[PDB]
Design a protein around this nucleic acid. Structure first.
Ligand SMILES: [Ca+2]
Ligand SMILES: [Ca+2]
Ligand SMILES: [Ca+2]
Lengths: 161, 161
DNA sequence: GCAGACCGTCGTGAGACAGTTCCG
DNA sequence: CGGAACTGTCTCACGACGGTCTGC
């Protein structure tokens, strides 16, 4: 199992070369709510240092998928899905600093999702948090994300709310 | 005073957004050997996230120099001197992964300096290590540093050895 | 004659997503 | 269907040093 010093190290590496984000994919095949919520944490590093990513990979119980080369000489290690993020994250949050807020919003999105997936009014409250995770990852001078406002006018126009 | 999980985080954060390096400063006013060897670890981060640097700073015993803006919207925190690094680095080495080697090599130079100060031949063995550190922070395809090849040239020209 | 600390910076290595296609 | 898994990219935020410059 994950040692406290192994969790702190990864917490610290993630704060620096890693990313905790969230997005909304347009799914043409979905029924009422035509969007998938994707939640992830990643580690980015030049392709030569690849073995170091693999090591962490092993420490986190081989969860997620490694990639030797995105296609620009960079390697990444990506972990999406609430299953893995509901077991990994809580082991890191206590040690995370810069991206602690992010991590806690993700966790929050996870526990609200089972009731929001077939209910437009709740899905909208969930998407509002999606917008917070994204803004937290932006400069103060950058344009804020607008997922909620665009889904609100789409849910009304569709008579879903 | 540093807890094992506090060190592990800093080693993690250092491997991510930090630097472990060494260099030769040309010093015209120095007598026999006119170079200063400089040993430093640094942390780099965008201007708005300065307060996280500070926490680390207070956590390491307030050693080094905080800097709110290098002048390009970026903030850093540098620690020079063998005096600080001989206390901080041994607390990090056991958790360091990506820049571990650089650390060990840096501790090495600290052991050899007292005798290399006034001895050109021993200062030359030291400068090899200064090249090694610099090489370690380069890609395989990059030019390797030449500090030994030119200071041997100098030392023969000047008749110092 | 010593060594700190105080100002700058080129050339990438990252971050934070997006588009498409798989999978039982 | 609904998610897990492959692709691929514009835009900075980093890294790893280099010159002066004090104030002894
Ligand atoms: Ca970072
Ligand atoms: Ca790095
Ligand atoms: Ca970085």
């Amino acid at each position: 199992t994950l040692q406290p010093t192994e969790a702190a190290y990864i917490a610290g590496f993630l704060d620096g070369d890693g990313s905790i984000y969230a997005r909304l994919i347009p799914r043409p095949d979905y029924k009422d709510i035509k969007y998938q919520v994707e939640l992830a944490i990643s580690f980015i590093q030049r392709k030569d240092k690849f073995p170091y990513l693999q090591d962490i990979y092993d420490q986190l119980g081989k969860r997620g998928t490694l990639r030797k080369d995105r296609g620009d000489g960079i390697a990444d290690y990506t972990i999406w899905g609430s299953t893995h993020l509901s077991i990994i994250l809580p082991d890191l949050v206590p040690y995370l600093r810069i991206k602690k807020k992010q991590a806690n919003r993700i966790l929050h999105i996870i526990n609200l999702y089972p009731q929001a997936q077939k209910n437009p009014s709740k899905f909208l409250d969930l998407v509002k948090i999606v917008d917070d995770v994204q803004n937290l990852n932006k400069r103060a001078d950058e344009l804020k994300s607008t997922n909620y406002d665009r889904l609100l006018e789409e849910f009304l126009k569709a008579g879903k709310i």
